[PDB]
Coordinates of C-alpha atoms and ligand atoms in Angstrom, one line a residue:
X1 CA 127.1 300.2 141.3
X2 CA 130.5 298.6 142.2
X3 CA 128.4 296.0 144.2
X4 CA 127.6 295.6 140.5
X5 CA 131.0 294.1 139.7
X6 CA 131.1 291.7 142.8
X7 CA 127.8 290.1 141.9
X8 CA 129.1 289.3 138.4
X9 CA 132.4 288.0 139.9
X10 CA 131.0 285.9 142.7
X11 CA 128.5 284.3 140.4
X12 CA 130.6 283.4 137.4
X13 CA 132.5 280.2 136.8
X14 CA 136.2 280.5 137.0
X15 CA 137.7 278.9 133.8
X16 CA 140.6 276.5 134.2
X17 CA 144.3 277.4 134.3
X18 CA 144.8 275.9 130.8
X19 CA 141.8 277.9 129.5
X20 CA 143.0 281.3 131.0
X21 CA 146.6 280.8 129.8
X22 CA 147.9 281.8 133.2
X23 CA 150.5 278.9 133.4
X24 CA 152.4 280.4 130.3
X25 CA 155.4 282.7 131.0
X26 CA 154.3 284.3 127.6
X27 CA 151.0 285.3 129.2
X28 CA 149.5 288.7 128.1
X29 CA 146.7 290.7 129.7
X30 CA 146.1 293.2 127.0
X31 CA 142.9 291.5 125.6
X32 CA 141.5 290.8 129.1
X33 CA 139.0 293.0 130.8
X34 CA 139.3 294.0 134.5
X35 CA 136.6 291.4 135.1
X36 CA 138.7 288.6 133.4
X37 CA 141.8 289.5 135.5
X38 CA 139.7 289.1 138.6
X39 CA 138.8 285.5 137.4
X40 CA 142.5 284.8 136.6
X41 CA 143.4 285.9 140.0
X42 CA 140.8 283.6 141.7
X43 CA 142.1 280.8 139.6
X44 CA 145.6 281.6 140.8
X45 CA 144.4 281.1 144.4
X46 CA 142.3 278.0 143.7
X47 CA 144.9 276.2 141.5
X48 CA 147.6 276.8 144.2
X49 CA 145.3 274.9 146.7
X50 CA 145.1 278.1 148.8
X51 CA 141.3 278.3 148.8
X52 CA 141.2 274.7 150.1
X53 CA 144.2 274.7 152.6
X54 CA 143.3 278.0 154.3
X55 CA 139.5 277.7 153.9
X56 CA 138.8 281.0 152.2
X57 CA 135.2 282.0 151.6
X58 CA 134.5 282.7 147.9
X59 CA 132.6 285.9 148.4
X60 CA 135.5 287.2 150.6
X61 CA 138.3 286.4 148.1
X62 CA 136.2 288.1 145.3
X63 CA 135.8 291.3 147.4
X64 CA 139.5 291.2 148.4
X65 CA 140.5 291.0 144.7
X66 CA 138.3 294.0 143.6
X67 CA 139.5 296.0 146.6
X68 CA 143.1 295.3 145.6
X69 CA 142.3 296.3 142.0
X70 CA 140.4 299.4 143.2
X71 CA 143.4 300.6 145.1
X72 CA 145.7 301.1 142.2
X73 CA 145.5 304.2 140.0
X74 CA 144.3 303.7 136.4
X75 CA 145.7 307.3 135.7
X76 CA 149.3 305.8 136.3
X77 CA 150.7 304.3 133.1
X78 CA 152.8 301.4 134.3
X79 CA 152.5 301.2 138.1
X80 CA 148.8 300.1 138.1
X81 CA 146.6 297.1 138.7
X82 CA 147.7 295.4 135.5
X83 CA 151.3 295.5 136.5
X84 CA 150.4 293.9 139.9
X85 CA 148.2 291.3 138.2
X86 CA 151.0 290.3 135.8
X87 CA 153.5 290.0 138.7
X88 CA 151.1 287.6 140.4
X89 CA 150.6 285.8 137.0
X90 CA 154.4 285.5 136.7
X91 CA 154.6 284.1 140.3
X92 CA 151.8 281.6 139.3
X93 CA 153.8 280.5 136.2
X94 CA 157.0 280.3 138.1
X95 CA 155.5 278.1 140.7
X96 CA 153.7 275.7 138.2
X97 CA 155.7 275.8 134.9
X98 CA 159.0 276.7 136.6
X99 CA 158.4 274.0 139.2
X100 CA 159.0 276.1 142.3
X101 CA 155.7 275.1 144.2
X102 CA 157.5 271.9 145.4
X103 CA 160.4 273.9 146.9
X104 CA 158.2 276.1 149.2
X105 CA 155.7 275.8 152.1
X106 CA 152.0 276.7 151.7
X107 CA 152.2 279.7 153.9
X108 CA 155.2 280.9 151.8
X109 CA 153.3 280.5 148.6
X110 CA 150.2 282.2 150.1
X111 CA 152.2 285.2 151.3
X112 CA 154.1 285.6 147.9
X113 CA 150.9 285.6 145.9
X114 CA 149.2 288.2 148.2
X115 CA 152.5 290.1 148.2
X116 CA 152.9 290.1 144.4
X117 CA 149.3 291.3 143.9
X118 CA 149.7 293.9 146.6
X119 CA 153.3 295.0 146.0
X120 CA 152.6 298.5 144.4
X121 CA 149.3 299.4 146.0
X122 CA 148.5 303.0 145.7
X123 CA 151.6 303.8 143.6
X124 CA 151.2 307.4 142.2
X125 CA 153.8 307.4 139.4
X126 CA 157.6 307.2 139.4
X127 CA 158.4 310.9 139.0
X128 CA 155.5 312.0 141.2
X129 CA 156.4 311.3 144.8
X130 CA 153.5 312.8 146.9
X131 CA 154.1 309.9 149.3
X132 CA 157.7 311.1 149.7
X133 CA 157.1 314.9 150.2
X134 CA 154.0 314.9 152.6
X135 CA 155.6 312.4 155.0
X136 CA 157.6 313.0 158.2
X137 CA 161.0 314.2 157.3
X138 CA 163.3 311.7 159.0
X139 CA 162.6 310.1 155.7
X140 CA 166.3 310.8 155.1
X141 CA 167.6 307.6 156.7
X142 CA 166.3 306.6 153.2
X143 CA 165.1 303.2 154.0
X144 CA 164.1 303.4 150.2
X145 CA 161.8 300.8 151.3
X146 CA 159.6 303.8 152.0
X147 CA 157.3 303.6 149.0
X148 CA 157.4 299.9 149.8
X149 CA 156.4 300.6 153.4
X150 CA 153.4 302.5 152.0
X151 CA 152.5 299.5 149.7
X152 CA 152.6 297.2 152.7
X153 CA 150.6 299.6 154.8
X154 CA 147.9 299.4 152.1
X155 CA 148.2 295.7 151.7
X156 CA 147.5 295.2 155.4
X157 CA 144.8 297.8 155.4
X158 CA 142.8 295.8 152.8
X159 CA 143.6 292.4 154.4
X160 CA 142.1 293.7 157.6
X161 CA 139.1 295.4 156.0
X162 CA 135.6 293.9 156.7
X163 CA 134.5 291.7 153.9
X164 CA 138.1 291.2 152.8
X165 CA 139.9 289.0 155.4
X166 CA 141.1 286.2 153.2
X167 CA 143.5 285.1 155.9
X168 CA 140.8 284.7 158.7
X169 CA 141.0 280.9 158.2
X170 CA 144.5 280.9 159.6
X171 CA 145.5 280.2 163.1
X172 CA 147.1 283.1 165.0
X173 CA 150.6 281.5 164.5
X174 CA 150.0 281.0 160.8
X175 CA 148.7 284.5 160.4
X176 CA 151.8 286.0 162.1
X177 CA 154.2 284.0 160.0
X178 CA 152.3 284.8 156.8
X179 CA 152.2 288.6 157.4
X180 CA 155.9 288.5 158.3
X181 CA 156.7 287.2 154.8
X182 CA 154.2 289.5 153.0
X183 CA 156.2 292.3 154.6
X184 CA 159.5 290.9 153.5
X185 CA 158.1 290.1 150.1
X186 CA 156.8 293.7 149.4
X187 CA 159.9 295.4 150.8
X188 CA 162.0 293.1 148.7
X189 CA 160.4 294.9 145.6
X190 CA 162.6 297.9 146.4
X191 CA 165.5 297.6 143.9
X192 CA 168.0 299.1 146.3
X193 CA 167.4 296.1 148.5
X194 CA 167.8 293.7 145.6
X195 CA 171.1 295.3 144.6
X196 CA 172.3 295.1 148.2
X197 CA 171.5 291.4 148.6
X198 CA 172.0 289.7 145.2
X199 CA 175.8 289.2 145.7
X200 CA 175.0 286.8 148.5
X201 CA 172.5 285.0 146.3
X202 CA 174.9 284.8 143.3
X203 CA 177.9 283.8 145.5
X204 CA 175.9 280.8 146.8
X205 CA 175.0 279.8 143.2
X206 CA 178.6 280.4 142.0
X207 CA 180.3 278.6 145.0
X208 CA 177.6 275.9 144.9
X209 CA 176.7 276.3 148.6
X210 CA 173.0 277.0 148.0
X211 CA 170.4 275.4 150.3
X212 CA 166.7 276.2 150.9
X213 CA 166.6 274.2 154.2
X214 CA 168.7 277.1 155.6
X215 CA 165.9 279.5 156.7
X216 CA 168.1 282.5 155.8
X217 CA 168.6 281.2 152.2
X218 CA 164.8 280.7 152.0
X219 CA 164.0 284.4 152.7
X220 CA 166.8 285.5 150.3
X221 CA 165.3 283.3 147.6
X222 CA 161.8 284.7 148.2
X223 CA 163.1 288.3 147.8
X224 CA 164.8 287.3 144.5
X225 CA 161.7 285.5 143.3
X226 CA 159.6 288.6 144.0
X227 CA 162.0 290.8 142.1
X228 CA 162.0 288.2 139.2
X229 CA 158.2 288.4 138.9
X230 CA 158.1 292.3 139.4
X231 CA 160.5 292.7 136.4
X232 CA 159.0 289.9 134.4
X233 CA 157.5 292.1 131.6
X234 CA 161.1 292.4 130.5
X235 CA 161.0 288.7 129.6
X236 CA 157.8 288.9 127.4
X237 CA 157.5 287.9 123.7
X238 CA 159.0 290.8 121.8
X239 CA 155.8 292.6 120.7
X240 CA 154.3 292.6 124.3
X241 CA 157.6 293.8 125.8
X242 CA 157.7 296.7 123.4
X243 CA 154.3 297.9 124.4
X244 CA 155.2 297.5 128.1
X245 CA 158.4 299.5 127.5
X246 CA 156.1 302.1 126.1
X247 CA 154.1 302.4 129.3
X248 CA 157.2 302.4 131.4
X249 CA 158.5 305.2 129.2
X250 CA 155.3 307.3 129.4
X251 CA 155.5 307.2 133.2
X252 CA 159.3 307.7 133.3
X253 CA 158.9 311.0 131.2
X254 CA 155.4 312.3 132.2
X255 CA 155.3 312.5 136.0
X274 CA 165.3 311.5 121.9
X275 CA 161.8 310.1 121.3
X276 CA 161.4 306.3 121.6
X277 CA 165.0 307.0 120.5
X278 CA 166.3 306.9 124.1
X279 CA 164.3 303.8 125.0
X280 CA 166.3 301.0 123.3
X281 CA 169.6 301.9 124.9
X282 CA 167.9 302.2 128.3
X283 CA 166.1 298.8 128.0
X284 CA 169.5 297.3 127.3
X285 CA 171.0 299.2 130.2
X286 CA 168.4 298.0 132.5
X287 CA 168.6 294.4 131.3
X288 CA 172.4 294.3 131.6
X289 CA 172.5 296.1 135.0
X290 CA 169.7 294.3 136.6
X291 CA 167.7 291.6 134.9
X292 CA 170.1 289.3 133.1
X293 CA 172.0 288.0 136.2
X294 CA 168.9 287.4 138.2
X295 CA 167.1 285.3 135.6
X296 CA 170.4 283.4 135.1
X297 CA 170.5 282.6 138.9
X298 CA 166.8 281.7 139.0
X299 CA 167.4 279.2 136.1
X300 CA 170.3 277.5 138.0
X301 CA 168.0 277.0 141.0
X302 CA 165.3 275.6 138.6
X303 CA 166.0 275.5 134.9
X304 CA 162.3 275.3 134.0
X305 CA 162.4 279.0 134.6
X306 CA 164.7 279.3 131.5
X307 CA 161.8 280.7 129.5
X308 CA 162.3 283.9 131.4
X309 CA 166.1 284.0 130.8
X310 CA 165.5 283.2 127.1
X311 CA 162.9 286.0 126.9
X312 CA 165.1 288.4 128.6
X313 CA 168.0 287.7 126.2
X314 CA 165.9 287.7 123.1
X315 CA 164.4 291.1 124.1
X316 CA 168.1 292.3 124.5
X317 CA 169.1 291.2 121.0
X318 CA 166.1 293.1 119.7
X319 CA 166.6 296.3 121.8
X320 CA 170.3 296.2 120.9
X321 CA 169.7 295.8 117.2
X322 CA 167.2 298.7 117.1
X323 CA 169.5 300.7 119.4
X324 CA 172.2 300.6 116.7
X325 CA 170.1 302.9 114.5
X326 CA 168.8 299.9 112.4
Ligands
LIG401 C1 162.1 307.6 144.1 N1 161.9 306.5 143.1 C2 161.7 307.0 141.8 C3 161.4 305.8 140.8 N2 162.5 304.8 140.9 C4 163.6 305.1 140.1 C5 164.7 304.1 140.0 N3 165.1 303.7 138.7 C6 164.4 302.7 138.0 C7 163.4 301.9 138.6 C8 162.8 300.9 137.8 F1 161.9 300.1 138.4 C9 163.1 300.7 136.5 C10 162.4 299.7 135.7 O1 161.5 299.0 136.2 C11 162.9 299.5 134.3 C12 162.3 298.9 133.1 C13 161.4 297.8 132.9 N4 161.2 297.3 131.7 C14 160.3 296.3 131.8 C15 159.8 296.0 133.0 S1 160.5 297.1 134.1 N5 162.9 299.5 132.0 C16 163.8 300.5 132.4 C17 164.6 301.4 131.6 C18 164.1 302.7 131.3 C19 164.2 303.7 132.3 C20 163.7 305.0 132.0 C21 163.1 305.2 130.8 C22 163.0 304.3 129.9 C23 163.5 303.0 130.1 O2 162.3 304.7 128.8 C24 162.1 306.1 129.0 O3 162.5 306.4 130.3 C25 163.8 300.5 133.8 O4 164.5 301.3 134.6 C26 164.1 301.4 135.9 C27 164.8 302.4 136.7 C28 162.8 304.4 142.3 C29 163.0 305.6 143.2
LIG402 MG1 157.2 298.5 143.7
LIG403 ZN1 156.3 296.6 140.9

């Protein structure tokens, strides 16, 4: 058992990117089995040249993927393996379809994919902070990045695990740089951090001073990209988005029915999502499909919200 799943995975052919649909921003995972997401994930690595460039062994990447999947909680409604998988998927799409691959280094890409996949490891549920309570008090500094420090702890734990060391093909200098960025990438998924840094990102777009050769503006962009992907369900074709909002809602009430939801989706869109997917689109307007999706979802939640 469990060694079960790996034999299946290690053996099977990985369908192409076209065949798995992973290049579409409109991607949906609902039909897929856990087994099929694993394959999608391998394809993500392979088609980003990561298996080649960092000489990853196939058995190892497979065991890492299942270990990552294993370490989410199915009992949690939204913050689970499928959320993480979708975030990686979105990061895939944004690199290929949104043409961001060409604006980044290989280590950068490697670290973002591992980050995205790993960015909510061990999440227990939004209203259900056991990570918070049974911790050292002196969690009052409120680095908020505190859940996110847990996630990175767990990301590093798996990375290091025997069988699972997909970064062992790196040089010690490469490994250090990569991990640095995984850390920043996962901590960037704290929304408090996004709120605190987006002004700078939007100013540079507004004032037209934006420049990725500046190492500081690189890191910034990577935090913003991570957030974009993490939220990206908000951009999905309406009937997917609705279902995802349902899971979000389950978790946000269960540790004035669907009634509350529409107003809250619009709130969240307006407060957070809209401006980000606008900015991303200025940087690369092949990412427009996310903006478009975000807006179309807004029209639809607004219309319903008005007691249709
Ligand atoms: C201690 N922790 C506790 C958890 N967290 C709280 C901060 N607030 C947060 C954190 C979040 F990430 C989201 C978030 O990811 C959102 C999304 C998404 N839609 C699509 C993709 S993501 N929709 C809504 C709106 C909403 C909020 C509550 C609801 C509801 C709808 O329906 C019923 O209840 C979101 O609000 C959020 C509020 C961070 C701090
Ligand atoms: Mg998170
Ligand atoms: Zn997340």
